[PDB]
Amino acid sequence: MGSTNPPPPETSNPNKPKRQTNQLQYLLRVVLKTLWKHQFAWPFQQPVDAVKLNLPDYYKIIKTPMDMGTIKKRLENNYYWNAQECIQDFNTMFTNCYIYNKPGDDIVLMAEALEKLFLQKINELPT
């Protein structure tokens, strides 16, 4: 009975309604793909590996995990109905980090930076 990771969030669901919208296209081609290149993106590019990171309490505390690897596949797979569903997943990712960690932590300064840039990029979306 060593620690294990939960299964990752789904990135496909054939019975879920979906669309490709200009805004969701933009969220992938511009927003995600620009945030992915940032110096602070790396901890967020895949589900938190609580076993690798020796954070056995991570999934005790965080019950709605989210990361940009999952978001990226959702966008590529056209999993979303609208931009707001996707924005909500970015918000969950940030909020998770701020819940598990504390102000001033390195991982928190990283999230805060990404979050400010995210907000700047989604300030204006296509029609």
Angle between helices 68-76 and 83-100 (to 10 degrees): 170
* DSSP annotation of 8: P
Region 21-125: CATH code: 1.20.920.10
d(CA 69, CA 90): 11
SS (H, E, C) 34-103: HHCCCCCCHHHCCCCCCCCCCCCCHHHHCCCCCCHHHHHHHHHCCCCCCHHHHHHHHHHHHHHHHHHCCC
Experimental method: X-ray
Domain residue limits, the chain = 21-125
